Design a protein around this ligand. Sequence first.
Ligand SMILES: O=S(=O)(O)C[C@H]1CNC[C@@H](O)[C@@H]1O
Ligand SMILES: [K+]
Length: 660
Amino acid sequence: MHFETTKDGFTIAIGNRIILSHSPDKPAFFAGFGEERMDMYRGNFDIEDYVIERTALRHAEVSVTLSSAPGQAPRLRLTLDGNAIRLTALDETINRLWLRVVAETDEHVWGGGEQMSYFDMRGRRFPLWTSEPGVGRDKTTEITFKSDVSGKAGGDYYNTNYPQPTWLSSRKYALHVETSAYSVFDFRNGDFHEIEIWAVPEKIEFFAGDSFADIVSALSLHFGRQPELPDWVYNGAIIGLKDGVNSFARLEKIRAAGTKVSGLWCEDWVGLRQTSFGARLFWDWQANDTRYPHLRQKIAELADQGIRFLGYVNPYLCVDGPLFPVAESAGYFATDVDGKTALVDFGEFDCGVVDFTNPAAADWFAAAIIGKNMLDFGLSGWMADFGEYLPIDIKLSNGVDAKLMHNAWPTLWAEVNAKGVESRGKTGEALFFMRAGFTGVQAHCPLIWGGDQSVDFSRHDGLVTVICGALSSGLMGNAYHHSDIGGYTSLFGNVRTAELIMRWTEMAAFTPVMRTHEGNRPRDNLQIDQDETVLAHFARMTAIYVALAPYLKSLSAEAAKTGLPVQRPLFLHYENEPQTYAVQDCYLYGADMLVAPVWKAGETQRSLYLPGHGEWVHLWSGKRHAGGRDITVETPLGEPAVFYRADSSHHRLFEQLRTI
Ligand SMILES: O=S(=O)(O)C[C@H]1CNC[C@@H](O)[C@@H]1O
Ligand SMILES: [K+]
């Protein structure tokens, strides 16, 4: 950065780009004090602040100290240090800070973690607090209304399992706030962005470069990159079943249709806790002999067939399981204000929270559960779930306020998984996937999944939200994203259709990982093995995925070398084309393919903007289309709107896909 004096105050810039501007009349910082309410109900948060003070820091003295007015005691010190602005609270009573960053009227801003509704965040406000993302997520839909009424569970456009206080600006810089406190990105004003933080962050860090790609590279180096995808993934789809021993018979039927399979993922490897409300799992992280009486043998048999086995784990322990008394005896649970084990309500059962701030507890979970019970048992991967349910009234062994540990949790959890994996020498071979995140998850977690979508084509909780989650999380340095094929949440009569499964499968073939899921109510929802048309369509798309493996491998190698995500926004490679900047329902699958998933029912065609000044080749027909215009193509089931660059080095490969 470059600091510079002006008539009335100062500016801070990154090269050509003014970032902060301060004068008494147009101050950069405001400081104050609030009393928040943050009530948790089954991982949903009802958050409302009561602001008692918000006071402009109008007087700057030059390292810069800031006070409310001349002759008042300084409240904030700002120190420029390389690409960082370091902040020190001089008034210990501040628990609210607002920072204005200079903005241009037509500027776009992206990132914010994994955003599910809006990719370009301009014009709206985005609180950053990990939680349940919501069912429906749109106060105008009946699903959302019903979820709010029954369980405070509808959420809204800004809720996410993985927030992050980082943005990329169309002005060619990125900004990162180093804090785990609650924060908000307010992009509602034309002339400035405003950051609200419920703390004085240690620093704000900046990244700039001459391309957006270069900035994403630099961000990915800052947060940490992922290993390349393991070879075994490229064998096909990961088939999600939760049907006990019957899972194997159903897998055989799936394989008999020609489906290419890399793995069998059985989240019920620990037992099902079937309830009147849903087919839940038994949260005790060891193989269940009642549900899978020969599981060790079955894993070995599948391995001989070239199919891996994957499970399920989360960082909580159910009160009625055998691991709970072990963890409690050792003092490894978060505690309540009286020093007893704090129990969290997950609906049909209560759990303890393994306290990862206690190094012994974190080591125990990595060694006993990830190491012995999972990896040594023969798992090649798993869903590494949750991370969002830390309540703010719980006590942690490190003595740090739960208001600050809440957002840190997903990263601590990712690190426990990564340490277990590394302890067995399996980094880059074991594949675990997380839905929750925060700053730093990038370094530990090798694969994101989009969490729970409704089983529908809705705008704010259906298929299309996955694309937004992939694009946003990709710019934040998570190179690999995928989703549950066919979505997850079935409530209030909302159930899958054949069409939904097929469209979702079409997208998933052009992402790093194809994975199915029977969902929360398996017997109420269509599954890939239960309709012959769906199953044949699925098998065909898995053959397309396998044929594409050499190209996906090259993208994984690129991700390791340069940090660029596999699924990229159009603007990353077409910077001079304004119409690419807000597009969030299409992506570049590497530089050489363009994917425009169908995300509504009953569509026989798809319209999209084709970028560039060359030619794109339609994957299924071989017909050529000129870049630089809107086009419409036929998209019958099995033929998603996918194109490849005419000049691609992988053209011989892409030509073959037409034939399969
Ligand atoms: O029903 S359970 O809560 O036990 C398991 C679910 C948890 N969230 C993610 C889903 O994919 C799981 O099926
Ligand atoms: K959701």
